[PDB]
C-alpha cells in the first residue's frame, strides 16, 4: 500500500553475523589496476636455494 | 542451481519490426544478467551486461530492461545483421545460460515440394535399406512427417535433418531418413511418407512399391 | 583487438584424457580472469570453469568437478584445460573467454569469446563413408523439376565435404547437417533440383571428400 | 540544500524508447524512496511511479503499467525511468521527487520536486519555421498606437525565440505561447505596439531563431 | 572488558575545525555501529551522529547536518568525527558509544559509552587567573566559626587547581564549580570555615595553579 | 522531533524507599525506550532497553514499565550506590534524551550559615568590585538570595554557583557573586544580601557600608 | 568427497592451553568459512566459534569469549583453535565443520562435519585401573544361567578395553560406558551370562588393557 | 540467547512407522532452522536446511515443516538406517542446538534379570567397597533401582550406567554401583537393591548379608 | 570511465578567508581521492590523499572531507602562497582528474581601459589585416568583446587572449584579434569593438573608418 | 630531495615517433612504480600510463592504448615513454611522477611530479615571425596615458621572447600568451602604456627573439 519507503533509520547497524561467510564466486577475478606497484620492503632478502 | 528460461524459443520477425524477448530466472538474481548474441557457426558476442548497460561498440537500437526474476531484451528496429540467436545469462551465482532465442526471417507461406527416394541396390547388397523423404523450399519450418509401410506407422527407426534458412529466399529444406534391415525391408511392399503443413489444405503422400 | 585461439580439440575415446589450450593476444592476459564455456546441441550453453588472474581461485561446474582441471601460464599467455575421465556427454564445442573489466564490488562474466574447438567423445573408430545414389524417377518429379542426390552414410568422424560436378553445379544444392546414429557413425544427405528435361543427357556426379581418412569418392547417380 | 536535476527528455517518434535520468544531491539519496510524477496541459498533475529506497517495491500508474520501468542506482545516486512504447499522450514534463521523512505508520508523499524535463512524443519531422509579416495599417491603428508583428508558423520542434531589432525593442512585445496544431507542427505569433507617427520612417525587423534547425530569420514588417 | 578512549578535544576558536577520535578495544570494532553523543549544561544529552558498521549509512542531528562528518577506520579500530564551522553552542563533552547487539527487526541504541572528551568553543585568549583574598572579619563570623576564602577570577581556559596550605587543610573546604561570565572568562570561589579563636595566629594561604599558562600563585588571606 | 519529558526533575528520597520516576514522549514510541544511569564525572551506563528488559549485570531491584507515551522506572529498594541521574531515551525516530532526574539524599532540615566578603583593595585598584555572599551547609537546596544596594533591588549583575551534595553530611553550599565596575561600586554605600530558607522563620540579612 | 581430520586433542590440566587443528581436503578450503562446534554429555551440542573465509571476521560463543582463538592457514588448508585458560566444563568432543554454499542474502550454517577430537580437562594424573572380580553365586543364578563380571575401577584417563578369554567369548558380553566419579577417576563394569552348569570347570578370565598407561591385567573370576 | 526445545526427548518407534518430532524456539527465528542427524560414535550429518529444503543425497522420506517458532520433522516410513539422534538448530541469531531427540527401537515388554555382586575381599583390603546391582535385558529403559542397607534408603552414594540398545533384541542393561568406605561397609549387615519395572507386578528385591 | 567534476570552476577569494571547494565523482569511489595543488608554470604538488590524510610537509591549514561521491577541500585561513589551481583525482578505478579550481585574488572593481589598433600598412601590403582591441587593467576577468563591421556582429573570425593576474595590482588584460583578408577588409568601412563589463554602466565602443 | 628531470620533448610531425625519458634521483628508483601524466589546455590533466617497479604490469589510458609504450631501465634509473603514431591532440606537457609509499592493500597514486617536457605535434614547418607595429594615435589615448605595442604574427614553434628597449623598459609591459591559429602558426601581442606627453620624443623599439630560428628583430613603433 503506502508503507514507509525510507530507512528506519534505527535499524540494525551491526553485522548479521550469520551473513555469507564464504567467498563469492562472482567476485572480481581481474587484477586491480591501481594496486601496490612499489617493491615490498618486507620481502624475501635471502637467496632462493632453488635458483638456477 | 539457478534455472533460466527464454521465451519464445523461436521468433519469426521482419526487418523494421520491434522485437522483445523475455528471460526468467527461477530465483532472484538482482540485476546481474547479461545478453549474448551468436550467429550460426560463429562465436557468441557480448551485447548487454548489468541487464541494461550497452557494451561499447553495440548500436543503440538494442536495449535491456528488467529486474529480479523477469528480464527483457528489446530491439527497436530489426536490421539484417541482427538475425541470430540470443542467450541470456545470469551471473549472480555461478553462471547459467538460457536455451536461446533464434530470430527467424519472416516471409510468405510456401508449401513444401515432396520427393521420395528408395534404397539403392548397392545399399541393399550391403545389408541396410535407407528410404529418404525430402521437403524442399517450405515456410514456416513446422511440418509433420509420418512414415507408413503398408499403412503401418514407423517409430524409432527414422532421423530428421533440417537446413538453415536459405540466404536467397529464406526457405527451409528437410530430409527424413528411414533405416531398416534388408530382411525388414523385403518383408513389405509399399513405402510412403505423409507430410502435413499449414500451407497444405490436405496431407501430401508419396509412396513406392518394392521392386517397381 | 582482442583475439583468442583455441587448439587441442579432436576425437578421443571415452575414459581417456585431452588437454585444450587457448592462446591470447591483443591484451594483457595476466591481468584478467578467464572462463571455459562449452556448447552442445543437447544442453545448449554450459559454463565449465573459471580461473582467477593469478590462478589462486578456480571454480568448476558440478557436472565436471573432480575431472577437469583449469590452469594458466601467464609467462606464455596460455590458458589450459586438462579434461580427464571423459564421458560421451562431454562432446561439445569449447570456448575460452575473457572476463570483462568492471568495478570492485560488481559481479563478473565474459565479454570476448574465443574461436572454439570441437571435442568429440566417442568409441567409434576412424572409417570412410559409404556413398549411395539418390536416383530420380517418376516418383521424384513434379512438373519440370526433379530431385537427385547422394547419401553419405556410416562415416566417422566429422566432417565431410560434398561437391557436384567438381563444383560446377552449386545452384539449388542442399547438403543437410549430419546426424549422429545409434551406432556412433554419422550420416548425411545432399540433394539438388534439376530440370526434368535434362535427365539422361547431363551427367551428375557427387564428389565426397573426407580428409581425416583421405577418402575421395566420385559417385555418378543415374536414373532408372 | 536538496537539489534534483532531470535529463534525457526530448522529441521521440511514437513506438520508440527513451530513458530519463534524475541526478540527486544535497541529501542521502539511498535512504529515501522516490517518485516520478508528470504534468501535461491535457491531464494536469499525474503520478507515474514510486520506488523504494532499496528498490524492493515498485508501483506504477495503471495507464503506464507494463510499459514504463522505474529503477535506481544508489552507487551513482541516480534515479532512472525507462519508457517503452511511447504514445502521443505521454508528452509532458516529468519530475523526479523525494519522499519526505515521517513516522513509521504514516502514509508518505513527496516534499521536494526536481526541475523537470520535457518529453514530446510526436511523429513530426524537424522543420524550420515560416516567418510571415503581420503588416500594420488603418485597420490595426487606434489613436496614436499601431500594432504589427510576425507569424512563426510550421516549425518543429519547440522552442523558438523572437526578438525585435536584435533585442533593442522590448517595450510592448507580446510573444504568445505556442499551440499544437492538427498537423503536428507548432505555430505562434509575436506582436508589438509602436507609435503610429513612427510608421514609414523607423525600421522594424523581427528576429526569429530556432536552435534545433539553426534557423535565423530577420523579417522586415512594412506598412501598407 | 569494553573500553573506549576519546582524544582530540581542546580549546578552539569559533569558525575553526577540530577532529575527535575514539579508540576502541575489548570487542570487534568493525562489527558494530557507533554513535557520537554530546552533553552540555544548556541542552543536556544530545545525540550527534550514527555510523553503520561498514560506513554505508550515516545520520546526523539537524543542528549539525552539513557541518559535522562522522567516519571510521576499521583497519585502525578508530572512530572519527570531523567538526567544521564550529559555533559557540557546540561547546560540550562528546562521547563515542557502541550500539548494542539485538534482533534483526528491533530498533537499536547504545549500551557502552566512552570516557568523553571536552570541546570548548570560545574566542577567549589564554589568560592566567586573578587571585583575590576573601578576608574574614566581624561581618563573616557567627559564634566560634569564621569563613575565609580565595576568589579565582577571569581565567581561561579550564581547568585550575586550588589547594589550601599546600594541601594540608582539606576539612571544611568548599571549592565551587566555575561559572562562565559574559566576558567568556571563568570565575570561581573556594571557602573554608575555621575556628574563630584561631584567627590572627594560623596562616592560611591558597595555592592556585593553572597548567595551560604555567601559573602558580600563593595568596595569603589575612583578617582585617 | 520527538520531545521527551521526565518527572519529577528532582526527587528527594531516602535509602530503602521505593522510587518511581516517569517519562513521557510527545508521540507514540511503542516500547522502544531505554533507561540510562549517570554518576557525576562518569560516563552513562545502560540500565534497561525495550522499556522492560534488564541489562546483564544490572541488579534485579531495577524494573521498567509502560507503553505508548507513558513509561516508568521503578527501584524497589534504593541503595547508596544508586544515587545518580536517570535519563530516558526514545529510539523510535532518531534519538532524543530527557532532561534527567537526579535522586537526592533526603535528610533533616539544616539552616544555612551566611557570610559576606567585600571586594579587596587590590581588585578595587584593578577597576572591578566583586562582593561575595556565602550560604554554607544547608538543606534542602531551595533558597532565595536577594541583593540590595542602598535598599535598591539588583537584577542582572549577580551570578550563583552551587556545589553537589557533600559526601559527609549531604549538605549544599552556595556562592553568590555580585560584580560591579569600580565607578558603579564607589557610587553607592550599603551592600546587603538577604537570605530566605525553609528552616528560617524570618529572612537573615548581612550588609556592609562601602569603606567601613 | 569432503573430508575433515581433527588432531591435537588429549588430556590437559585446568588452566593450561591446547591447540586443535583441522586438516581439510576434498574441496577448496580457502573459499569457505568454518565452524568449531563441541559436544559434551552435560550441555549437548554447543557452537564454539566461526571464522570467515579470509579470516576477516570471527565470532565466539559467550561462554568462551576471550579464552579461545580461532584462526586458519589457507596456504596449508588448516583450521586452528588455540584454547587458553581451560575450565572443567570445556571437556568435550570438538568438531570442525564446513559452511554450506548458499545465496548472498541467506543465513548460513554447516553441512559437513569433521571426525571430532576429544578434549578432557582434568587435574587427574595418568593411572592404571584396578580390576576386581564380580563373582557369581546362588544370588546371581536364575535357572541354568548365571552372571559374572569384572569391575574396572579408578583409572584415568579414557579409554580402557576389556576382553573375555582373549576374545574367544563375545556372546552375552555387556561392557558399560564409563562414569566419572567425584574423585576424577573413571569406572565401569563388564558382565557376561554363562551356563550355570559350566561354573567351576570352565575358566573365565577378563583381560583389561589400557594403552595410555600400557596396563595389562588378566583377572580370573571364580565363584564363591 | 535463543532457547531451543525438542519434543519428545525420546520416541519409541518401529520400522515403517510415521514419525513426527517437534522443535520450538523461545522467539521468532523465521525459517532459518536446520535439522542434523547423528549416529552414535560418528559425526553428525546434515539433513535439512531452511526448515524445508532437502539436502542433496538425503532420501525423500524425510520432510520438514513449520515457521516462526514451531517446526516439525516428519519421516513418512522409518527405515533401519534412520535409527539415530535428530537435532534441530536455529541459525537466525548465532547458533544454538536443541537437546536432541533419540529414536528408539520399539519392541515387546521384557522384564529385567536382576543380579547382585558383593565387594571382593581384595577391594575390601584396598580400603573401598563397591556393590554392584545389574539389570539385564529389559525393556523399556525406564526402571527404578533403590539401594537399602539394613532397610535404610541410600541417596547420593550410587552411580548408574546404561548401555545402548542391544543389536540382537533391542533391550537395555543397567548397572548401579554403590560405593562405601570399608569402615562404613563393615558397620552394617544387609545390602539390598530393589528394582521396579512396568513389566513386574511386584518389586523385585535382591539382598545379601555382609560376610555371608 | 569515471567522470570527475569540481565546483566552482573559479573562486574569487581574499587572504584570510575560509575557502571550501567541492569535487564529485560520477560513481562511488569510496575514499580513494587525492588533491593536488599546482602553481602556474610549475609542477603539481600533492596535498591530500585518502580524501582526508595530510601529506607530510603540508601546513595544517589544509583539510579534506568527504566520502563516496562528494568531497571537499577546506582552507581555514588563506595565505598568499595558497593562490594556485587545485585538482582532485580519483584513484579507485584508473586515474582521472577534475577540471581544476583556480583560487583567484579578490579585489575591488576596476573598469578597463580600452584601446584600439588598426592594421599596419606593412601587414596590409602582406595580404592580411589584423585589428586589435585591447582591454587593460580590469577586474574581474569576465568581460565581453564584440566586433561590429558596419554595425554587423562578427563570428568565427576573432581570437581572444587573456593575461594572468598582475603580481602588483591583481588586474587582467585582454587582447582580441580580428583577422581578415585584405579584400574582405576593403569590402567594408566601419570597424568597431564593443566591450561590456560589470564595472561599466554602459558599453564602451571604439571604432575606426577604413583608411582613416 | 626527490628530483625528476624529463627530456626528449620537442616538435614532431603527425605520424612520426618520439621517445621521452625521465631521470630520477634522490630516492631508490627501482623500488617504486611510475606514472606518465600529460596536461593540455583542452583536456586538462589526463593520466597516460603506469608501470610497476619491476615492469611486470603496465597500464595505459584507452585513448593511447596500442600506440604508447612505457618502459624503464632500473640500471640507469631512467623511465621511458615511446610514443608512436602521434596525433595532433597529443600535444601537451608530459610529466613523470613517482608513486607514493603506502600500505599493502591500499590503492596508489603519485606524490612527486617531474618538471615536465613539452611535446607539440604539428605539421607546421619552422618559420620566423612577422613583427608589425601597433602604432599609438588619438584613437589609442585616454587622458595622459597611451598604449602602443608590437604584433608578432605567424611564427612556429613556441616560444618567442619580447623585450622593450633591450630590456630597459619593463614597467607596464603586457605580453599576452600565444594563441594557436587555424593555420598552425602562433601569434601574440605585446603592449605597453606610456605617458602621452612623451610621444614623438622617446623612442620605443620592441626586440623579438626566436631561438629555434635564430631570429632577432628590433622593430620601431612610430605614431601616426
Swiss-Prot record, chain A:
During host cell invasion, proteolytically cleaved at the cell membrane in the region I by a papain-like cysteine protease of parasite origin. Cleavage is triggered by the sporozoite contact with highly sulfated heparan sulfate proteoglycans (HSPGs) present on the host hepatocyte cell surface. Cleavage exposes the TSP type-1 (TSR) domain and is required for productive invasion of host hepatocytes but not for adhesion to the host cell membrane. Cleavage is dispensable for sporozoite development in the oocyst, motility and for traversal of host and vector cells. Sequence repeats lie at residues 2-5, 6-9, 10-13, 14-17, 18-21, 22-25, 26-29, 30-33, 34-37, 38-41, 42-45, 46-49, 50-52. CSP immunodominant B cell epitopes are primarily located in the central repeats. Antibodies against CSP and particularly against the central repeats can neutralize infection at the pre-liver stage and thus makes CSP an attractive candidate for the development of vaccines. It is found in: Cell membrane; Cytoplasm. Belongs to the plasmodium circumsporozoite protein family. Essential sporozoite protein. In the mosquito vector, required for sporozoite development in the oocyst, migration through the vector hemolymph and entry into the vector salivary glands. In the vertebrate host, required for sporozoite migration through the host dermis and infection of host hepatocytes. Binds to highly sulfated heparan sulfate proteoglycans (HSPGs) on the surface of host hepatocytes. The N-terminus is involved in the initial binding to heparan sulfate proteoglycans (HSPGs) on the surface of host hepatocytes. The N-terminus masks the TSP type-1 (TSR) domain which maintains the sporozoites in a migratory state, enabling them to complete their journey to the salivary gland in the mosquito vector and then to the host liver. The unmasking of the TSP type-1 (TSR) domain when the sporozoite interacts with the host hepatocyte also protects sporozoites from host antibodies. This is Circumsporozoite protein. The gene is CSP.
Amino acid at each position: 500500500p503506502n508503507a514507509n519507503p525510507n530507512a528506519n533509520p534505527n535499524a540494525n547497524p551491526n553485522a548479521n553475523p550469520n551473513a555469507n561467510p564464504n567467498a563469492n564466486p562472482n567476485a572480481n577475478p581481474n587484477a586491480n589496476p591501481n594496486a601496490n606497484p612499489n617493491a615490498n620492503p618486507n620481502a624475501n632478502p635471502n637467496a632462493n636455494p632453488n635458483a638456477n | 542451481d539457478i534455472q533460466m528460461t527464454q521465451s519464445p524459443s523461436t521468433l519469426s520477425t521482419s526487418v523494421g519490426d520491434r522485437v522483445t524477448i523475455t528471460c526468467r530466472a527461477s530465483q532472484s538474481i538482482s540485476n546481474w544478467l547479461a545478453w549474448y548474441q551468436q550467429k550460426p557457426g560463429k562465436a557468441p558476442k557480448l551485447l548487454i551486461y548489468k541487464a541494461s548497460t550497452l557494451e561499447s561498440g553495440v548500436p543503440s537500437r538494442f536495449s535491456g530492461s528488467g529486474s529480479g526474476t523477469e528480464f527483457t531484451l528489446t530491439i527497436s528496429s530489426l536490421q539484417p545483421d541482427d538475425f541470430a540467436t540470443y542467450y541470456c545469462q545470469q551471473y549472480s551465482s555461478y553462471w547459467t545460460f538460457g536455451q536461446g532465442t533464434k530470430l527467424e526471417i519472416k516471409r510468405t507461406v510456401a508449401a513444401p515440394s515432396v520427393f521420395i527416394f528408395p534404397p539403392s541396390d548397392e545399399q541393399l547388397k550391403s545389408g541396410t535399406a535407407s528410404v529418404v523423404c525430402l521437403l524442399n523450399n517450405f515456410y514456416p519450418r513446422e511440418a509433420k512427417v509420418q512414415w507408413k509401410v503398408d499403412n503401418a506407422l514407423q517409430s524409432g527407426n527414422s532421423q530428421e535433418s533440417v537446413t538453415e534458412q536459405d540466404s536467397k529466399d529464406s526457405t527451409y529444406s528437410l530430409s527424413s531418413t528411414l533405416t531398416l534391415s534388408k530382411a525388414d525391408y523385403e518383408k513389405h511392399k509399399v513405402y510412403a511418407c505423409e507430410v502435413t503443413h499449414q500451407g497444405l489444405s490436405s496431407p501430401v503422400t508419396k509412396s513406392f512399391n518394392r521392386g517397381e | 583487438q582482442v583475439q583468442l585461439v583455441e587448439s587441442g580439440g579432436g576425437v578421443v575415446q571415452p575414459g581417456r584424457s585431452l588437454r585444450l589450450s587457448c592462446a591470447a593476444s591483443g591484451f594483457t592476459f595476466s591481468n584478467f580472469g578467464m572462463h571455459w564455456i562449452r556448447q552442445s546441441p543437447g544442453k545448449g550453453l554450459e559454463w565449465v570453469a573459471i580461473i582467477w588472474y593469478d590462478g589462486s581461485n578456480t571454480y568448476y561446474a558440478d557436472s565436471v568437478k573432480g575431472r577437469f582441471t583449469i590452469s594458466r601460464d601467464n609467462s606464455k599467455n596460455t590458458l589450459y584445460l586438462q579434461m580427464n575421465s571423459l564421458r560421451a556427454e562431454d562432446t561439445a564445442v569449447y570456448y575460452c573467454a575473457k572476463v570483462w573489466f568492471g568495478e570492485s564490488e560488481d559481479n563478473y562474466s565474459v565479454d570476448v569469446w574465443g574461436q572454439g574447438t570441437t571435442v568429440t567423445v566417442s568409441s567409434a573408430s576412424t572409417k570412410g563413408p559409404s556413398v549411395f545414389p539418390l536416383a530420380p524417377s517418376s516418383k521424384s518429379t513434379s512438373g519440370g523439376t526433379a530431385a537427385l542426390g547422394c547419401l553419405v552414410k556410416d562415416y566417422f568422424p566429422e566432417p565431410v565435404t560434398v561437391s557436384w560436378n567438381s563444383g560446377a553445379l552449386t545452384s539449388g544444392v542442399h547438403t543437410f547437417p549430419a546426424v549422429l546414429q545409434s551406432s556412433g557413425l554419422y550420416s548425411l544427405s545432399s540433394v539438388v533440383t534439376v530440370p526434368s528435361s535434362s535427365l539422361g543427357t547431363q551427367t551428375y556426379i557427387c564428389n565426397v571428400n573426407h580428409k581425416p581418412s583421405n577418402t575421395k569418392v566420385d559417385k555418378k547417380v543415374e536414373p532408372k
